Design a binder for these strands. Structure first.
Ligand SMILES: [Ca+2]
Ligand SMILES: [Ca+2]
Ligand SMILES: [Ca+2]
Ligand SMILES: [Ca+2]
Ligand SMILES: [Ca+2]
Lengths: 96, 98, 86, 54, 83, 98
DNA sequence: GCTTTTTTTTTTCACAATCCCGGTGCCGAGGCCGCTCAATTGGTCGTAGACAGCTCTAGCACCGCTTAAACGCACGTACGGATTCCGTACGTGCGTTTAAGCGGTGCTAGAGCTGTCTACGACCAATTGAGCGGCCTCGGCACCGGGATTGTGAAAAAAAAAAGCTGCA
DNA sequence: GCTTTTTTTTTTCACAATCCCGGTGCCGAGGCCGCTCAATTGGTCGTAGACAGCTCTAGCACCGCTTAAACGCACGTACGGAATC
């Protein structure tokens, strides 16, 4: 019993061990990281939802995400954010 | 020779323009400025005329209202002349500016 | 394509016009240093508003910024504008 | 409210300015349309006290 | 005295400490009431919305989410309580 | 007889609290306020513990932030002491009160 | 140049705060356990949207005259800001008082979870009228001139407030 | 307590600016028309959520200690702001 409430935590931990494999993290800190991921996910999806909606299109595609990201993140961060979202899709396409 | 006291015409201008709603920037200078800035982001762009008018409506309003905030900021420091630092405080408290 | 590169049009925003906007804002007396400072502000407004409109254009693949591009862009900056569609 | 400001301005049809005056002079409507800009609307007659003559 | 105006429970010492953390040096006497005013309007606004959430969800227990969702609406997005 | 001059503990207290993260309002009084105010919208309400802490993080955060802006206005009026008219101006400019 | 004061500067001493040593013990990050549902899959089907081709809107350029606005300079007033100076609202630091904080026990409201059943919403196709674009008109309203009214400002002259000037006590 | 000026107040015209009307003219508000495509009708089917019942979570009340924090008061320094220039 006790509900079953999902969260991005196991992934926040996985990324942490990529960037700093010996540093850990508190529950309040991991609660802020989960608040952070959900916040921006809703930001980027909402701006995609509207993009798509303004252009009479039914599908959010990776292109909507990339236009939403130019709109939401500041210059130098958008740049890496595109660079990584492009590269991840290319790599995914490449595999199968 | 008749001569109006400094402030008496400013005060008239103040009433003249508050009563009205027509745009206060010269429409072509502004249009040239839209186009100039837009080049930075993409070349050989056309603008709908309504898009340019929508931009001069949104601009004038933004400044006209910043000038309100700015005037309070002058008066808050027992002055009557709005100064650069006034705008800058207005914008820093608005959070437009670090 | 038949001449279009732009000049230095920021001085087009004359001292008369900045003075008139200050007047609408109920400002009585204006320092020397306001006018240049104002143009900076205005420029930074326009740069931000057009970047975003220009994005909405480039996405819909157009080469023509619509009023809706500017409208959608303005609502994004929390500067919602009434009377040009949407 | 627009139409009252229309009538008070001595005109038959409502224009932007009437709407604006009606929105800004009404406490609640102005809150609801707080971050909203009405094109060709202008501002309410407001001059700060200390800016007036003695 | 000591009676049912819980706003006064917000002590001068605690108001001083906030404005410290906010880089304030010298604090007018009138301010501790101004602050008290302002704090209430803040809570009124947030709590009205949070409980508006509560009544919609058909519950008697105000959740931390209800507050989170309220604070988002008021533009005061809060991280680390369920975001 | 050791006596620090006005404002010299202030600065200690600033440095001190800016270094720290801990709620500055006493938790029980705060909570008693949250129930007092909640009544005016619905009776016999229960709160999660974390609901009250979500409310108290949010409050202090706002207050601290408002004090920064208040200080700035007070310094803008060539003063060192914040006063209500500083708070009220920073709120006028935040668009919080008309 | 000298001496005589304020002010400024330097030097010395007091005290918080940090960091280095020595330590202990609690509590939750972390990670393993054991079950479960949400991600994955290949299949099938329908239509979103890429594309290419077609129409024709409306956006861009260019001109030349008219005149409103911007422009730049002369002129002086009221503003900004520096300085001074006075009254007290604040900050500091004591001792006394207060209730928050903590840890704990005991009760139950109510949050939430499970299974059942059907009222209500999706979806479909056929039906038709509400609301679209088009297009025509005539009355509101923008612009003008002329006459009435309101308010500003200078100049002349008063009322008063304040300043500089007295002897006395 | 004056005599002698500055400061502040008052009154009298001159002049500009704004105000209000009718006259005039142009064009877009308003509305009618005819045709369309989206709202409506009447039908079907499936499941979202209302509902009763039960579980046990965590919210509340209470109590009794130990301080740390709030409190109130004495005292004066550095501040706000008035006044001048
Ligand atoms: Ca150690
Ligand atoms: Ca005083
Ligand atoms: Ca129940
Ligand atoms: Ca029509
Ligand atoms: Ca008509």
């Amino acid at each position: 019993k006790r509900s079953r409430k999902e969260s991005y935590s196991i992934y926040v931990y996985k990324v942490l061990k990529q960037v700093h494999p010996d540093t850990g993290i508190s529950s309040k800190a991991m609660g802020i990281m989960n608040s952070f991921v959900n916040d921006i996910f809703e930001r980027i999806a909402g701006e995609a939802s509207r993009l798509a909606h303004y252009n009479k299109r039914s599908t959010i595609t990776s292109r909507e995400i990339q236009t939403a990201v130019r709109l939401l993140l500041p210059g130098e961060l958008a740049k890496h954010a595109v660079s990584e979202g492009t590269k991840a899709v290319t790599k995914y396409t490449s595999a199968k | 020779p008749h001569r109006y006291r400094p402030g008496t015409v400013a005060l008239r201008e103040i009433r003249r323009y508050q009563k009205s709603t027509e745009l206060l920037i010269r429409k072509l200078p502004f249009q040239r400025l839209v186009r100039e800035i837009a080049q930075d982001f993409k070349t050989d762009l056309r603008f709908q005329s309504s898009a340019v008018m929508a931009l001069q409506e949104a601009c004038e309003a933004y400044l006209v209202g910043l000038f309100e905030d700015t005037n309070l900021c002058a008066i808050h420091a027992k002055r009557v002349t709005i100064m650069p630092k006034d705008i800058q405080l207005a914008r820093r408290i608005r959070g437009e500016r670090a | 394509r038949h001449r279009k590169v732009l000049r230095d049009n920021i001085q087009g925003i004359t001292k008369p016009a900045i003075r008139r906007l200050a007047r609408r804002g109920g400002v009585k007396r204006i320092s020397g240093l306001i006018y240049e400072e104002t143009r900076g502000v205005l420029k930074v407004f326009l740069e931000n508003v057009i970047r975003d409109a220009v994005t909405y254009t480039e996405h819909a693949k157009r080469k023509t910024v619509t009023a809706m591009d500017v409208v959608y862009a303005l609502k994004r900056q929390g500067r919602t504008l009434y009377g040009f569609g949407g | 409210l627009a139409g009252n400001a229309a009538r008070d301005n001595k005109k038959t049809r409502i224009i932007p300015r009437h709407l604006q005056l009606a929105i800004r002079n009404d406490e609640e409507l102005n809150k609801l349309l707080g971050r909203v800009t009405i094109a060709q609307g202008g501002v309410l007659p407001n001059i700060q006290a200390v800016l007036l003559p003695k």
